[PDB]
Amino acid sequence: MPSLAPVLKNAMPAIVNVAVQGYFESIGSGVIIDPKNGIIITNDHVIRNANLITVTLQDGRRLKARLIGGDSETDLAVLKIDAKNLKSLVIGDSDKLEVGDYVVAIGNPFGLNSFGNSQSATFGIVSALKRSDLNIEGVENFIQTDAAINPGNAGGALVNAKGELIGINTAIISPYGGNVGIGFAIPINMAKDVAQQIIKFGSIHRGLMGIFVQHLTPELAQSMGYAEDFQGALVSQVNQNSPAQLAGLKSGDVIVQINDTKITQATQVKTTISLLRAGSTAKIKILRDNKPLTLDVEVTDIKKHEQKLQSNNPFLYGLALRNFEQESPPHGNVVGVQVVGASETSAGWRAGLRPGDIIISANKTPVKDIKSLQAVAHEKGKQLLVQVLRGAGALYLLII
Amino acid sequence: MPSLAPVLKNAMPAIVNVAVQGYFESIGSGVIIDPKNGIIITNDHVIRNANLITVTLQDGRRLKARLIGGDSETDLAVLKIDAKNLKSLVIGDSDKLEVGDYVVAIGNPFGLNSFGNSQSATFGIVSALKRSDLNIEGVENFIQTDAAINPGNAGGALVNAKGELIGINTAIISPYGGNVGIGFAIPINMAKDVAQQIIKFGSIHRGLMGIFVQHLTPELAQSMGYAEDFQGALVSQVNQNSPAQLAGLKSGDVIVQINDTKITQATQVKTTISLLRAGSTAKIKILRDNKPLTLDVEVTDIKKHEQKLQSNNPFLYGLALRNFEQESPPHGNVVGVQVVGASETSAGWRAGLRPGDIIISANKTPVKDIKSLQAVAHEKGKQLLVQVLRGAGALYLLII
Amino acid sequence: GDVIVQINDTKITQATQVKTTISLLRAGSTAKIKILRDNKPLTLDVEVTDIKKHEQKLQSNNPFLYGLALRNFEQESPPHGNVVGVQVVGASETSAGWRAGLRPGDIIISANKTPVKDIKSLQAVAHEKGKQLLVQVLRGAGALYLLII
């Protein structure tokens, strides 16, 4: 007989039961990645805010679990179980998945197996790949399956016909919270990378290139000189003083490949960079007009680069400024720069500077334009003193 | 072509439609077990409280159905149809089922086939086996399937890839009552046994061994001297004056096999005994410590055992008694037995004895403890006369 | 019945002063307590000990039954018949017993396959040291096996 029984026999031990207690009892599933060190993988939201987490095997053993690390962005987490005689599953290649491939989802939906010896298997094909824009997670590269995934199936395994592990069941789209044949799983290659990174450092340190990326439609590709069937990631903006700008990356460029990964659409860029660790160079392969180029862009920590940026310009950082000219009573003819916006973390905001203020003098020197203001700001003192107009009133502020 | 069409062709005639009218119209499905005598099987809850039940075949024939018997505990029922030229399907072995085997569920969901010629087939694998603790039915040994089972699928057939009958679709778990890929069917071996027992006696007469069973976890197994991977049904309690107690069964014993059926977990004991008929001996194979033993335990009707139990101790039966000593005004020093609880069926309760009462005298003889009370109870009279303390007051009661 | 009359330098004239005087003291430091037992003057040196530490010294002394309130129990309760053992009046959520799934109202009839008729007997079985103590309890009509580690 044509059956999935033999293959599923060799996969079920690897899938376990996770029980959670917090300040509140949550249940979910887990997969055993490395039976040697006894470490299992599951969804972050399962073990979120958890005092005690308990893992039960098909053996029937109940074991206290220790939390190595977790990542809210990709909804992944790694646990260590202090046990032996654990069994595991062969890991597979999610990048080789094709729509229409048969898959089985193994997990504990509705807490059905009290004793852990009977996980639930549900059967389906791969509906779609590389799902994004779902807004379920910060970083999404989902596998879409019509195999039945319900509450409690999270952290469960999604396996191909051979029984290799290709995904971790995460979320579903439902009008009423029950499975309607649409479910999502995190591809194992992405998931394994996150896990292996977690064990090594205890957390994921992520960086930004400071680039905005736009989907490249065929209509749009023609106007930029490319072929209709051309594919890639269009670069709409490269931010000011960003690692991308330093590398020489420009607007109108089309990202065609990042490192080993090849890029055919914009949504692929964010997922590729998210796996990369901060402080490490990323090889970006682009086409500027129709000329091939290769750029090495630093992937930089968010907080760290925000200090280098403040260091360059301490006083005026985090401020949106517009040149301002108006005849406003009782001030009379007013010429200076207006504070369109201020950052709550900025030196200006701390000083009491507010949006809508008009800066007329800095360090007792009249300011008629932004370029003049930046000059006075450029010369370095412990503090910059500014005089601003707030409504009918005026104020003196000290940016330290 | 790789299809289920040929096999389902030889299965669809066996599945029929059941229509019910009561005081209220209910619809469901049925399967034809014996075409010779024209007997069909279905869920008990379909034909519950039913004045007239009508069966329609794929032939298009509509037939009045007669109710042989039904069992609320396993939610099964047998119907006899007075017709000829009926077709049926080969019955199969549910015990040979494995998780991942392809199965099809045949029934009339939502009443879609008005004329009976087009049952609905739904395709899925076997999600799990031996489901229990669901608390849907009194006796549960369900097959879990992700094939689509909806209202009106009850009493329908669940068939393997060969087209053999392996289950009767019974219940689903859903947040909103629609199929979410989790559905349950009664394994055919169990269902066939119930049916054949019904045909023979018209009802199921069930008995209790008076034994409490606990799941044996590997952690728990070690401390009792067994292997970590050992499996069985731990005997937590053997009731007082029970058939199990007479046979010599004790706490700490592990049921490893009952009759032909081998036992690997606690939930299997209840389902196994449920099939057994009262007044029939059950062969119980246990391990006391690590020593193999065999005991033959009588499976006894509940009403009969409680009459043997009442006969043994007539007056004080159904009473929970605690030795009582207290200095309570206006009684002064009070010594006697206190009625912690009384059974509404008890001789004591009928006599007007209530919980909280303190028995200080029996048959004009002072009672200072339970053992003394039981002695006075042991000597036989048509009635036992007791003197009780009810609050500040006292009462004389006559227990017959 | 002893009367604290002075702690260290601070002299004590009413009860509320004891708590405030000790509250200032740092853990792991000896406190000089001056009392009157009946009408005879005495001086005692009492260790001021951390709460978490003392509760670890306390668990070590009695590992299995710590955090439990136990009462001797005798009752004739169907369907058990004559029941004699110790009843769990209360359990502490931090106790080894509570973790094992032991609940108040349970009646312990056996420990390590040995029948238990009273607290003194239970404490004896608990006193002999194993990694775990196995107990059999009565919960309502049912009975349960628990493993206290």
CB-side neighbour CA atoms (13 Å) of A190: 27
Give the resolution to one decimal, in Å.
3.2
Spell out the alpha helix ranges (H) of B202-291: 218-223, 243-247, 267-275
Q: Is C99 exposed, middle or buried (0-12, 13-18, 19+ CB in 10 A)?
A: middle
Task: Say how many C-beta atoms besides its own lie within 10 A of residue C78's C-beta.
Answer: 20
The beta-carbon neighbor of C145 closest among B220, B340, B343 is B220
Put simply, whether B343 touches C (Cβ < 8 Å) is yes
Question: What span, in angstroms and rounded, lies between the C-alpha atoms of B283 and C99?
Answer: 37
Spell out the alpha helix ranges (H) of A16-166: 44-47
Way it was determined: X-ray
Question: What span, in angstroms and rounded, lies between the C-alpha atoms of A9 and B44?
Answer: 34
Question: What does the block give as tokens for C121?
Answer: 């007997």
What would the DSSP string read from start to end of B160-225?
ETT--EEEEEEEE--SSSS--S-EEEEEHHHHHHHHHHHHHHSS----B--EEEEE--HHHHHHTT
Element (H, E) at B309: helix B302-312
CB spacing of A61 vs B218 below 8 angstroms: yes
What DSSP character marks residue C19?
A: H
SS3 B391: coil
The beta-carbon neighbor of B217 closest among A5, A62, A123 is A62
Q: Is B389 exposed, middle or buried (0-12, 13-18, 19+ CB in 10 A)?
A: buried
For residues C109-143, one letter each, b for 16 or more C-beta atoms within 10 angstroms of the residue's C-beta and e for the rest, the string is bbbeeeebeebebbbebbeeeeebbbbbbbbeeeb
User: Over the Cα atoms of chain A, what is R_g?
Assistant: 27
Question: What span, in angstroms and rounded, lies between the C-alpha atoms of B57 and B17?
Answer: 6
**Residues with Cβ within 8 Å of residue B98, at least 6 apart in sequence:** A3, A5, A9, B126, B129
Question: What does the block give as tokens for A220?
Answer: 């749009």
Question: What span, in angstroms and rounded, lies between the C-alpha atoms of B375 and C4?
Answer: 57
Nearest to A377 by CA among A313, A295, A286: A313
The beta-carbon neighbor of B223 closest among C75, C81, C132 is C132
Please name each of the domains of chain A with its CATH number.
1-201 (2.40.10.120), 202-312 (2.30.42.10), 313-400 (2.30.42.10)
Q: After which residues is chain B broken (C to N over 2.5 A)?
A: 23
**Residues with Cβ within 8 Å of residue A217, at least 6 apart in sequence:** none
Q: Is B92 exposed, middle or buried (0-12, 13-18, 19+ CB in 10 A)?
A: buried
CA-based nearest distance A5→chain B, Å: 4
CB spacing of B240 vs C78 below 8 angstroms: yes
CB spacing of C75 vs B214 below 8 angstroms: no
**For residue A104, which residues of chain B lie inside 8 Å, CB to CB?**
100, 125
Residue with tokens 């049921």: B255
What would the DSSP string read from start to end of B356-387?
T-EEEEETTEE--SHHHHHHHHHS--S-EEEE
Put simply, whether B131 touches A (Cβ < 8 Å) is yes
Q: Is B137 exposed, middle or buried (0-12, 13-18, 19+ CB in 10 A)?
A: buried
Is B316 within 8 Å of B337 (Cβ atoms)? Answer: no
Question: What span, in angstroms and rounded, lies between the C-alpha atoms of C85 and C77?
Answer: 13
Nearest to A73 by CA among A270, A243, A214: A270
Task: Say how many C-beta atoms besides its own lie within 10 A of residue C26's C-beta.
Answer: 7
Question: What span, in angstroms and rounded, lies between the C-alpha atoms of C138 and C106?
Answer: 5
Rounded to 5 degrees, φ, ψ at B105 are: -110, 120
